[PDB]
């Protein structure tokens, strides 16, 4: 069972950035497709920037957990 647990954890930590980049991207794309005015766009630019920062945070977390999971003593 430990092998299954480990592979689950590894795959989750590996796909975390892909999710942050793809599904939240689809949400942003829905919003872009639906919005027309200028005030809402001005306010949504900051959401896009926050998504940038969140993607970088997820990438850092994944890097940390992956260097923990792929570190061998011998």
């Amino acid at each position: 069972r430990f092998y299954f647990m480990y592979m689950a954890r590894t795959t989750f930590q590996a796909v975390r950035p892909l999710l942050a980049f793809s599904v939240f991207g689809e949400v942003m794309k829905l919003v872009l497709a639906t919005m027309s005015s200028g005030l809402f766009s001005f306010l949504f630019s900051f959401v896009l920037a926050f998504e940038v920062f969140y993607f970088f945070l997820q990438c850092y977390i994944s890097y940390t957990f992956l260097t923990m999971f792929f570190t061998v003593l011998f």
Partner: protein, 253 residues
Amino acid sequence: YATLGSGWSFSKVQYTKYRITKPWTTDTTFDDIILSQPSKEDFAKFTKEAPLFLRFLKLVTDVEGRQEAFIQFAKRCENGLTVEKDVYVTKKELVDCLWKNGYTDTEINAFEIAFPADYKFHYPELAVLFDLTEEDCYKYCIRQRAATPEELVELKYTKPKNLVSSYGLCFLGVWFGLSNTVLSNAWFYSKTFPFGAVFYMLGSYFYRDIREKLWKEEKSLIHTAQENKNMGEESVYKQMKKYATDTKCLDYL
């Protein structure tokens, strides 16, 4: 802004494809004085060595009869004079001022032998040396630096401002300006790119011919004006020299 300077040299500049570079500094930034409109606190400060100036100051004060000023200035200036960096007057400018305002050849030669050729006098030095106000000396230095504004001045470095709002507005700009078929139009390809490219190519190929053909008249006018000024001044001078000896008639009588 007015064009300050006492020079009659008609000067134009040609540009390169490289930007001006200055030595790295973590606290200062170089900029144009007229474009920045800086203040005394925006100017950057530094420490200058006193002794070479304090010796001449002691001499001048012993000559004029005011030693309290020297003592006060020396006690203020010890451990170096902290002053704005790009607010100064050159030795040549100062000597010209002295000569045209009537300081004796002895004093001028003292200045020359005392200070190097590349020395730079600042407004506190000028004030303590001529018994003037630092405000007036600062204004004079600023005018003399604006007369030569090709030289950049060193200000305190400040981080950019309003980056978040600027990002929002630039996003709005692109969102409203690129959601169109303007850069792919038949009008674009038929008029905007051809006319613009032809103008650019002609300007790049005849860049200098155009400038010369335009500046010919101004150069001729400036030459004419200078020649007239010179000839008139010379004639008046020589005539007054002729008539200079018309005062001894009285003391002869």
